[model samples]
Structures are given as structure tokens and as C-alpha cells.
Target chain A: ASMKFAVIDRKNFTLIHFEIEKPIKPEILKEIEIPSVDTRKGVVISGRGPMWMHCFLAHKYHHTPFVAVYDPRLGAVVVQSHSELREGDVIDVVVEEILK
Target chain B: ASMKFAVIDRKNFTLIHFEIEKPIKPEILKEIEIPSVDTRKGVVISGRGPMWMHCFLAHKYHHTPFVAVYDPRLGAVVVQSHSELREGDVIDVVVEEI
Candidate 1:
């Protein structure tokens, strides 16, 4: 069985959980880190490992900064850019950019 | 208006339509100068020269300060930055970013 990960929106504290087939690579793991989370809801963990990497991913891809939710099918992570999420909101995750 | 150019993202400013060739000799147009833009919306107009040319282009490209832009275009001939610009703004015809 793969690791069961939790996907949560930091802005609104929105959360979901799922699993990934394999773990992410070490370099990519190093790239994920964020400084702080907005308190509009809860800290959104867009990618799996660190806050900064997710922040880089969200910022670089969207070309606008964001909070994120880690999705399992998203190779152990997912992201959200801004504002907060509501319960039952469906986030459309895309491979816009890889920070590393 | 063929010269009806209003692509005023500043970062989006490409002078290819206004002047397709280098005002300076291709060998002499070493620096095209840009101060600011972003990781995207890169440059064109050929710096395909040497290291000094690229360095000169990057550091001096803008009146706006920048870290980088994506494409091969050099940043230059800028009059504003994120610090400037409002609605109905044009770059006021900056004489090409070199």
C-alpha cells in the first residue's frame, strides 16, 4: 500500500486525502518549502513535503503566488494560489510548472 | 494603423514590428538593456553575440530592475517599472531597449 497523504487548503483549511504510487525524487523533495501560511483558513499544504517548495510551484506556475493543497494523484502534492477554499470545492490541479 | 502598437505590459513590449533589424550594427548592438519584467515574456532582436553582449543586455536592459525573463530577447528601452504605469498607458515610444 502507498502512503496515504492529506491534501489541505491553507487559506480556508479545506482538506482531502489520497495516495501516490511512488514517492517524489530527492531533488524535488528539496525544492518544496514555504515560509508562512495565510490564516484566512488553515495553512494550505499544496505539495507534500515542505511549505516553500509548494510556494515556489504555485508562484512560478500560476505566475501569481498562492496557497496549496497536496493531492496524491498529483505525485504526492497539489497546490492552490489564493484566497480560501470552501468545503466540497473541486480544485483543478495542472502541471503548470515544476519548481525544481 | 501598422504602428498602432499598444502592447503595454512593458514586459510584452517587442519592437520587432517597429524595427525588424538592428539600429546599431549587429556586432555593436551588444547591450539591449532591461530593468524589470519577470520569469516569462522573454526578449528577441538577436544578441546572438558573445558573453559581454548577453551580460550587457541583461543588466542594463531596463529602466525597470529585473531578475529575468524567459525568451531570447534582451530587455531594454524601458521608461517604467512595476513602480509605474496606470490604465490607458503606453510606453511613450521608448526608442528601442538598446
Candidate 2:
């Protein structure tokens, strides 16, 4: 299929999911849903998509207090922090594991 | 000024940090630290680095249950899941607002 994302309201944190199926271009973003998010609780971005899209998402939520990205090997580690949180700081969360 | 990542032991979850200072090539990764992880509580990746580097990291941990990537706008969301977790599933996390 195509690439899509969602703005999930986790109450404590706003989760944004970037679901990818195949390689895509920047133009397709218009056809996709990129909703406005509430950055009050901060935004957690998760997706296995194109890096260009990831950069665009970062720009979309640049006004957020802090932004954390997900890694397959790490938990949610804070990258940009406008508050007291450090850049290398990892927020507490439960990342479920899958079997193959 | 170089790109680097650290494997953090948060106990409940294994957090990996990718620190980017400038644009770098894959060759520099040899000088960097790509430590082994426990991968029991799953892995959470956060960084504002180059996409090429991100791709490499993904390959390194292809054995994990799940891999989540960071978006400056959104909190940590799952991209690849090995367990019952869906790809679009947003793992419950507290992304503190700055």
C-alpha cells in the first residue's frame, strides 16, 4: 500500500505513527493524512518510513517543547528538548517485543 | 562534530540514542560505539541524525521484537513489530513536554 500516519492521543503523550508500505516520494504526502497534533504532552514519533518524510514531520511539530524519536534498538530517547530534559535522555515507556 | 549513538539500559526498556553533530559517511561508524543490547523490554530509538545512519541502525537490530523511530513532532511510535504489536500501534509512553 501507500504511506500513512496517525495522531494518537495517549493523554500523557501524543503519539504520531508513520506507517510505510513501499518507497514513496514527497508529493504523495498531500494525498496522505498529516493531521495537526496537540504538543502539550509532547510528541512521540514512530514510523518505519522514508527519512525525508521524517524530516518533514519534525518541521511540522517544531513548536513542540521536546521531540523524541524511536529506534529499534533503543527506547524513546529525547532529541530536542526545550525543557529540563537532556538530548540523550530516554523517557520511560514500554516497548513491546515481537517474535520474528 | 561526528555522529554517535548509545545503548541505554533503562531496565524496563532498552533505549538507544543517536547523536548527530554533522553529516557523516558510513565509514565513520567504525569509530563509533554500536553496543550490544538486552532486547528483553523492546527497543526505543531516538535521534535527530541522518536517515542513512538510521537505516544502518535498523539493520543492526533486525532481531528485536519491535523498533520505534523518533519524530520531533510525534512521540515514540512503532514502525516495525515482531510481536503482536501492529505497525501503526503507538506504544504508551510519556514524552515529556519541554
Best by DockQ: 2
| Candidate 2 to truth, TM | 0.46
Tell me, by TM-score, which candidate is best. Answer: 2
Give the chain B TM-score for each candidate.
0.26, 0.73
- C-alpha lDDT (0 to 100) for residue B87 of candidate 2: 49
True contacts kept of each: 0.00, 0.02
TM-score of each: 0.20, 0.46
lDDT of 2 by residue, B47-78 (tens): 66655355345434546776665555554555
Grade the docking of candidate 2: incorrect
**Model 2: per-residue Cα lDDT over A1-100, one tens digit each:** 5776667677556777777777654445335556677756676677766553554454345467666666656555555546535455556665553427
In terms of lDDT, the poorest run of 10 residues in model 2 chain A is A51-60
Q: CA lDDT of A80 in candidate 1?
A: 31
Q: What tens-digit string does per-residue lDDT give for candidate 1 at A1-100?
A: 3334444453434333333355533233233333333344433333343222232233333222323344434321222334444222334543233435
- Badly placed stretches (over 4 Å) of model 2 are A29-32, A97-100, B1-98
For each candidate in the order shown, give its overall lDDT on alpha carbons.
0.31, 0.58
DockQ of each: 0.01, 0.04
